[PDB]
Fold this protein.
Amino acid sequence: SRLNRESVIDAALELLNETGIDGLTTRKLAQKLGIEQPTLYWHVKNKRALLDALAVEILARHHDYSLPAAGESWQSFLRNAAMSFRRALLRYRDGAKVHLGTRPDEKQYDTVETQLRFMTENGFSLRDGLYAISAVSHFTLGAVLEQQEHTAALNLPPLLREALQIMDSDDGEQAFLHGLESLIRGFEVQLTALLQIV
Amino acid sequence: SRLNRESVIDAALELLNETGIDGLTTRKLAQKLGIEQPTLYWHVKNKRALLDALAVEILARHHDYSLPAAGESWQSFLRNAAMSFRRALLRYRDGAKVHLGTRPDEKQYDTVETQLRFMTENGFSLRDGLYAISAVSHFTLGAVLEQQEHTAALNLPPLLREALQIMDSDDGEQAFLHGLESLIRGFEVQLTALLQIV
Ligand SMILES: [Cl-]
Ligand SMILES: [Cl-]
Ligand SMILES: [Cl-]
Ligand SMILES: [Cl-]
């Protein structure tokens, strides 16, 4: 088949969905593209390079709320960017595992830069802007990984038998959205406090 | 060597530290214990069973702040339990990945039960108690996974070149502790609000 970057990534994401991250190999990708493994190697050197590229492409294709809108509040921005990040990770099988394994791109750096500038323009120190973005990112990756890795591996007390029911309710969105508001409000409280004991 | 449960788990955790989760195999474990693979199988059927057991043992050995102290506030409890959970995951290589792959034990259920009862005794609804515990857990697993998976794979803008410096500062503790306070304060605000628009 055609072996330009875009076509290779397309095939690899389709494979990812069929196999999961642990099952994804260059040998299967070559089979999927109708080529010998040495032909693939010219284009993609190893699994690591493949996954690095997938991780970037997934956000490039699907994380379309990475930047604030004209006039958006920083609360609203973090909320929107978290939801979008979440959706993008969930779009592919083991997507969050794919994401975790990566160090960031230059574009992601331009984008992260604009995000930190935005935060600091809104009254955050560099540190606190970064801490906030990091905590959203951690909380989001954590929740998706649990949603996703719940599937990988496949008699209860009053509250817990039922904790499990409350959860086997939707995909994880309610709990996710609820903790997200709690986090943002926490940041609010912090930012508003300035040097006052809080 | 001796092949009681405890000895097998000990050897397996030591192997985990030498190999990481992806590198851990029953064949290496058997070599480490001085036995043939069919002998090991009697004791541990596969990698999956092995990892399930490790995940439980790691928290049993090292997550020693899983329950509130006499008279402890729920804020203080979540803070302490988060720090402890964090430390336990960090104690072994790929520890958070080990943890993620698991569904919980019966003991973890007794323990989680007591935690949800504690939360509800303090004024949380079941839902909100669960949402809070989940968000702490997600945020913590997220942060540790990034700390840890930062290692697995091994020119910057004013703020970001420096975002990276702020981070390459400690292990992740500062950012973690800071987001943890933000989360707890968010829960506080929520709980205190009752039915008032907040
Ligand atoms: Cl073609
Ligand atoms: Cl081509
Ligand atoms: Cl012996
Ligand atoms: Cl024995």
Notes: DSSP finds ten helices and no strands in chain A. The pocket of chloride ion (ligand 4) is lined by residues B 2-4 (CB under 6 Å). The two ends of chain A are 61 Å apart (CA to CA).
